[PDB]
């Protein structure tokens, strides 16, 4: 059956990581006749957000969205990239010590490190980075590093996160089944782990059809007493994540 050939071909008619597009492109998916509730939320969001970056919906969208967000900060901040390149080496050692399979998990790390170093030295331009994030072989190899640290963060902190897993699964079963494999949607627990593991700070604009608090549903992860601005903002629509950008 060439059915999953056509399914995973609908997915592939869009790029992994689109170029920027005005936020009004999101509003144009909707209208007052058939999708009035979504149109309202999008139009509202467009007062704050000027642009959207569509991420392919292939099961990896959340990981790919965070990864794209992080790489964007690091193209604009040489210091932060230095810090991220080093603290990724701390992950390699963490992985191999938390008993992840050695040479395979090491090779994902090595590929990711080399990619960052090549940004740092200037070998890779901005253009070259987006091309790499759109080439399936390379982009997914890079994305695996992020699935791995998400899993590692949970295993590192297992007694703490164990009670938030349902279906009677242990943390290791959850990681093995829902975090480590590719094409697996991310849920809250995974999302919380990646953001903390990656040391980032995210606002999720939770765009659904429901009457909402002024400004729309949103979640800041982490949420703490501090009022630091989020460095990555995601658009969540039911079952899907894209990247969005405040105006100017």
């Amino acid at each position: 059956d060439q059915q999953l050939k056509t399914i995973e071909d609908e997915q592939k008619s869009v790029p992994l990581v689109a170029t920027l597009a005005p936020f009004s492109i999101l509003c144009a998916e909707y209208d007052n006749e058939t999708s009035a509730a979504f149109l309202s939320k999008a139009t509202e969001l467009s007062e704050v957000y000027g642009e959207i970056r569509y991420i392919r919906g292939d099961g990896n969208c959340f990981y790919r969205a965070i990864l794209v967000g992080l790489i964007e900060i690091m193209l604009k901040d040489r210091a932060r990239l230095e810090k991220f390149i080093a603290s990724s080496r701390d992950w390699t050692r963490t992985l191999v010590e938390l008993g992840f399979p050695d040479w395979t998990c090491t090779d994902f790390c090595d590929f990711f490190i080399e990619f960052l170093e090549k940004i740092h030295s200037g070998v890779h331009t901005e253009e070259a980075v987006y091309t790499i994030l759109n080439d399936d072989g390379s982009a997914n190899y890079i994305l695996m590093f992020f699935r791995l640290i998400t899993s590692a963060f949970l295993k590192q902190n297992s007694e703490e996160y164990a009670p938030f897993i349902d279906e009677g699964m242990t943390v290791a079963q959850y990681c093995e089944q829902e975090i480590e494999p590719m094409w697996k949607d991310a849920d809250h627990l995974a999302i919380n782990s990646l953001i903390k593991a990656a040391g980032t700070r995210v606002r999720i604009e939770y765009m659904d059809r429901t009457a909402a608090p002024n400004g729309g549903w949103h979640y800041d992860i982490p949420s703490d007493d501090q009022q630091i601005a989020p460095e990555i903002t995601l658009l969540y629509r039911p079952g899907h994540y894209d990247v969005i950008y405040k105006k100017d």
Partner: protein
């Protein structure tokens, strides 16, 4: 020109001695491997050798290897076409796993054939209801089909 993953895994597959498992790249196609797994001691498959075929698909390691038994075997996890019911070949595959993992897990499957539930089909049901007799049939098929030349 192969990706880095297949170059590295090929080198490991050639270097690593694994008891009862032999694996070779096809001379023409670098993604194609020929695998022989010895019937483990203390299983109905003892004395037999089982040929398996493994293919690394275009997106490997992001998708699972494809593995099939060529040697006919009476086992709850293997059907008439030699297709293999195994979690790490579909849903619990992750790219942190490797060919070695799959091969070792197929080997352990021969040693512990009874996986609590009937994966497929009439064979599995025969295994839980009358093990002694399923075990005997497996022994016979080993003699009939897995006994070399």
């Amino acid at each position: 020109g192969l990706p880095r993953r297949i170059i590295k895994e090929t080198q490991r597959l050639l270097a690593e001695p694994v008891p009862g498992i032999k694996a070779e790249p096809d001379e023409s196609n670098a993604r194609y491997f020929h695998v022989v797994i010895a019937g483990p001691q203390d299983s109905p498959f003892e004395g037999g050798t089982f040929k398996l075929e493994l293919f690394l698909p275009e997106e490997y390691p992001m998708a699972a290897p494809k593995v099939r038994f060529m040697t006919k075997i009476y086992h709850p996890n293997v059907d008439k076409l030699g297709r293999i019911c195994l979690d790490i070949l579909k849903d619990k595959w992750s790219p942190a796993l490797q060919i070695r993992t799959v091969l070792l897990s197929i080997q352990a499957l021969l040693s512990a054939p009874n996986p609590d539930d009937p994966l497929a089909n009439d064979v599995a049901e025969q295994w839980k209801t009358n093990e002694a007799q399923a075990i005997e049939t497996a022994r016979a098929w080993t003699r009939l089909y897995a006994m070399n030349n």
